[PDB]
Chains A and B, each alone.
Chain A
């Protein structure tokens, strides 16, 4: 009904909503699950650091044409510019895209710099068994900041 001077509402509760209501009491339990998942994945991982490299990006439309963002993949162009190939890169902790054609020279340069840095910065075990045998990190979200 209508009553005294009040702003007008639009509350969409005419539709058997009570049957379909999700609450998050598992807000904590799922956090536990996720921490446990990450830790366990890492534990089995053979120290590959739980996230693959992702590239620096020019952040679409106007509201965010300013920002710079972590995208998906590194443009085969920039890969072979660094001096390697997509397939070997994927075996390495790297993430590669075929879309996102490079059109901006500085971003080309930046990503190739990232890749060269990372290549110089990591240590790969032989195809055989014996190695320096470990030390784990779980970043690559952070050690190559954006």
Chain B
């Protein structure tokens, strides 16, 4: 098992750094033990624990930055949506719906009507 991110996400940056340091220390010692003994797979768990810790830390900074750029014009390029290149260019809903005033008048005057053919 080991550690769990839902337990870690309640912690702070400093506690997480200490945790990470402890994990790297332990990992170093385990590498020493790995040649003293034929096999040692407890090292996998601490390896994955480091990954989980780094993920959470990255998340904290990233969400801090996001709430910092909350509702700003230029967001960072690693924080915009990725959708795909051709879309990140292409028109917006606004620009697509932009319409000249002549066409507006014709649409309002003569829109397509609902009709039926019986009698």
A interface residues, Cβ below 8 angstroms from B: 46-49, 87-88, 90-93, 118, 121-125, 131, 134-137, 139-140, 143
Q: Which residue on B lies nearest to A88, using beta carbons?
A: B110
Contact A49 B110 (CB under 8 A): no
A residues in contact with B109, CB < 8 Å: 87
Given contacts A87-B106, A87-B109, contact A122 B117 (CB under 8 A): yes
The 5 closest A-B pairs by CB, nearest first: A125-B114, A87-B110, A137-B117, A91-B113, A124-B115
A131 proximity list for chain B (CB < 8 A) = 114
* In the complex, chain A residues whose CB is within 8 Å of the CB of B15: none
Number of interface residues of B (CB under 8 A): 12
Contacts of B111 in A (CB 8 A): 91
Interface residues of B (CB under 8 A from A): 106, 109-119
Q: Which residues of B contact A125 (CB under 8 A)?
A: 113-115
B contact face: mostly helix, strand, loop, or mixed: loop
- Name the A residues within 8 Å of B116 (CB-CB): 47-49, 122-123, 134-137
How distant is B63 from chain A, measured CB to nearest CB, in Å?
Answer: 43
Contacts of B114 in A (CB 8 A): 46-48, 124-125, 131
Tell me whether B112 and A123 are in contact (CB under 8 A).
no
* Residue contact B110 to A90, C-beta cutoff 8 Å: yes
CB distance from B110 to the nearest CB of A (A): 4
Asked if A143 contacts B110 (CB within 8 A), the reply is no
Q: Is there contact, CB below 8 Å, between B110 and A135? A: no
Q: Using Cβ atoms and an 8 Å threshold, which residues of chain B touch A90?
A: 110
A46 CB contacts on chain B under 8 angstroms: 114
Q: Considering residues B110, B112, B114, which has the most beta carbons from chain A within 10 angstroms of its beta carbon? A: B114
Give the chain B neighbours of A87 by CB distance below 8 A: 106, 109-110
Residues of B within 8 A of A93 (CB): 115, 117
Q: A22 to B85: give the CA distance in the assembly, Å.
A: 36
- Please name the residue on chain B nearest to A53 by beta carbon: B117
Give 11 pairs: A residue, B residue, CB < 8 Å, sorted on A.
Answer: A47-B114, A47-B116, A90-B110, A91-B110, A91-B113, A121-B117, A121-B119, A122-B115, A123-B119, A124-B114, A125-B113
Query: What distance in Å separates the Cβ of B16 from its nearest Cβ neighbour in chain A?
Result: 55
A residues near B119, Cβ cutoff 8 Å: 121, 123
Q: How far is the CA of A91 from the CA of B106 in the complex (A)?
A: 11
Partner of B118, one of A88, A91, A92, A135: A135
- The CA of A33 and the CA of B111, in the complex, are separated in Å by 29
